[model samples]
Target: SMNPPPPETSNPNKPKRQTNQLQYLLRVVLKTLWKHQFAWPFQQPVDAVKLNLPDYYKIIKTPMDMGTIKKRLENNYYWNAQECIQDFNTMFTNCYIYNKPGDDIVLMAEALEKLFLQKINELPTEE
Candidate 1:
């Protein structure tokens, strides 16, 4: 048996915490995007030349595979981005439990998804 506490009531005019879920997720996405920017493909002269081969051309033209995505995520820069993915999952899990739709979280998730796709697009591919 427990006495229920009163509902959380704060000053209506007061500001909220500086680091909320949205803010944290936004920061994580931005940092992930920034780090991905530097992860250039075709880094060496040979890499460019290799793209000329028919097999290489076909390979580059293909959309990224899950193995490729997972391999990239294993790298250091992308490892940091992994945290953002975890945060994203956490947000979704909480929302599921509460049975509420997270409008802002959904928007942020879309933005982050787009950004991540862009990085995938940035990888060496046929035009």
Candidate 2:
């Protein structure tokens, strides 16, 4: 059945907010890791891209939904959430700023822990 031109009605002010923010956040984090050459599980080494890449290179391909990241951190590495966050912070800060004198891996680990704590404070968690 085809109907044309229904009468005009008042619209409700439901929030038109996006549902994809979490997905976007995951993507940004993944791309950031990619920029540091840490996103891919190495089968063999290649030249670093120096910039983030789309998910095209992934075998499972599609933006890594949150569950996969969780499984990798949890099951693959047996890391808890805090440990995974600290690890991510360590890897990035190391790749980004590990050239200064006395800037060893230990310092990186300590700095990452503080940074992750601050980040967790800022994030709004769902209970």
Candidate 3:
């Protein structure tokens, strides 16, 4: 018994499209946080990278992932885009109160949120 090529052809790139997008989003967010030296929100310390790294990184040794980002945001974070936009506004509102201005943390948060919204939009509509 042997294997043979199937008649039906498919676009190879079609697979893992969403996963690729998600991974890119994950990497950008993590690198942003790491570059800025921001601590995990409520979890404290290096646990940020430990928890949410994608399965692939487990093999290669990169530092982070989306689930870790969620944990970093802690339990009170919202899922809706409009709600997150509002939350981002609230966070930015209080950023400079005790700290110096020009920090890019809020900017990165906003970008991550926008990336999530873009992912949502790309999902197939359930008409």
Candidate 4:
């Protein structure tokens, strides 16, 4: 038989997913992000009525939150690390767009985004 190489090493035909290793890691990462002090604002959907930021609805089309992301992870919504990355990206970008620059929450969002990146970047490479 010829020496056959694994497809993941250099191929790109289909997106291989569901390692379960990454799944547990993703859960832990999400739990840590949720437990962060600066994660409060991102824990839930932006309540336009209660928070008095009605304008947020108009600008931030793809609204995202930690709870939603967390639930999605549990529901197997993400096929890989990059999918989860973009959800966090969406959450942070929505904050930047809706909140004023240099605002406390905005600062929190920035730092939280960095923290998330740091954690997710450490996930074991599948390739």
Q: Which candidate has the highest lDDT of all? A: 4
- Runs of candidate 1 with Cα error greater than 4 angstroms are 1-99, 125-127
Residues 41-117 of candidate 3: C-alpha lDDT, one tens digit per residue: 31122232454523322333223233334442333233333432343333334332322446564555455545545
* Angstrom error at residue 81, model 2: 5.5
TM-score list, all predictions: 0.24, 0.27, 0.26, 0.78
The lDDT values for all models are 0.35, 0.35, 0.36, 0.71
Q: Tens-digit lDDT track for model 4 on 1-127?
A: 1222211222245344565545754566787889999988888777776777767677776778887777666556556767667777888888888888779998898888788777776776575
Residues 15-119, model 2: lDDT tens digits: 222223233323444334333322343211211243233222332211222234433432333223443454455344433342355645345444544544554
Report clashes for each candidate as comma-separated counts: 0, 0, 1, 0
Tens digit per residue, CA lDDT, model 1, 1-127: 1112221223345343322322433344434643553322311111324434333323322222222333233332232344435533443343233223565534443454577555434333222
Task: State the displacement of the C-alpha of residue 16, model 4, in Å, after optimal TM-score superposition.
Answer: 12
Tell me each candidate's RMSD, in Å, in order. Answer: 22.4, 17.1, 16.3, 12.4
Query: Which has the higher TM-score value, candidate number 1 or candidate number 4?
Result: 4
Quote the lDDT for 70 in model 1: 32
lDDT for residue 16 in candidate 3, whole number 0-100: 19
